[PDB]
């Protein structure tokens, strides 16, 4: 399209040399909140759908958490085109997170490196802002566009799982499916979570408020987990979701790594690393959680799509469903569209029926 090639070449380089990284976020949570966008001629087919997690998903391509962290832009976010919609990360008390600035461009890289730290407007907020669209939502899950909540943790919590349990007593009710974020790069010790024992005193605490939620009211628990785990942290975790039944895996969040090659002036701030740089190594972790859970449990693939094929390759190594984030800053809206228009194309061409016969199909080979 002309939407595309106008987005790509002309709107967003054009926002991008006018504005820093932050102020362009804060002015597209707006626009889409709003709905002014050029809006999607792309019409969903059959062969997007996917069943997972106990609902439909009219097409696998979310957004991923962090672009609407306080819930402000969720039907917007739909009428971009995206099968679902994830919020958050938010955190039980309000917190401002880090010091500004706090996000920088990587454009030879096509990259993104943040370290916001967890700003959010808090459980209260966001369970209210919810609240007022209920139903709305209620009739959009049906349709097949399905809401997810991500839960992260207070900068100066004494007790993280507690700050999990709280966030799905809370938004648990209005989700469809609830993330325990234990990944994020730019929270001190968030990441041990990730390890055995306490991976699994968390997750049975958590596992156990959601059962506590009345039946209509009970959504599906994910794990996103980082792209910088070790094998043996990945083979932990891989045993604890079994054991205890979590729902999914969403794989994965932001690196800490800095790949060689990054040619970014910015490419030495302080914080997670997304886009481009980030793909192959996103696309292999889900390929090991796919092995290591033996295909029985669902992945939410993310890091680095940006076209059919990005959402394709991490589809046959595993993954139900992906998200993207940065492609956006980049591509626009636009971009959304063209990734669905491609991966359809693609699949006829593969000889997959649909999107469902494609999952794992690179272990079967
Ligand atoms: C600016 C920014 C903020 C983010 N904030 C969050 C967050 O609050 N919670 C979370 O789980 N992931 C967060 N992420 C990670 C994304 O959800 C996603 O896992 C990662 O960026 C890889 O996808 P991408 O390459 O398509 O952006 C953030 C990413 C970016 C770029
Ligand atoms: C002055 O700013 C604009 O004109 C924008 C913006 N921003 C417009 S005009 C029509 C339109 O669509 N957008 C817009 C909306 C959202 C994004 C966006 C969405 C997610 C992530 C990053 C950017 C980009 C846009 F150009
Ligand atoms: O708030 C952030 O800094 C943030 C959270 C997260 O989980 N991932 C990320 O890249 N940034």
Redesign the pocket.
Known sequence: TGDERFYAEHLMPTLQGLLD?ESA?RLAVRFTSLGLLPRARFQDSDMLEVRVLGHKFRNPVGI????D?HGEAVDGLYKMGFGFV?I??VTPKPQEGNPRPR?FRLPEDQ??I?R?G?N?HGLSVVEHRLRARQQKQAKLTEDGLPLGV?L?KNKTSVDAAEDYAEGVRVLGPLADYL?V?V??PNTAGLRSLQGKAELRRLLTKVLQERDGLRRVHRPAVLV?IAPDLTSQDKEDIASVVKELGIDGL?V???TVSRPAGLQGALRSETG?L???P??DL?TQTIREMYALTQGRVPIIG?????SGQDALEKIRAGASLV?????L?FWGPPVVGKVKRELEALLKEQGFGGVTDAIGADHRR
């Open positions: 990284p976020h991923a958490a962090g672009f962290k994830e958050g990360s996000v990259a993104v943040n916001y967890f959010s991500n992260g993330v974020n990944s994020s996103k969403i994965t969040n932001t997670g997304s886009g481009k980030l793909r996103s993310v890091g680095g799509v940006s998200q993207l984030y940065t492609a800053t």
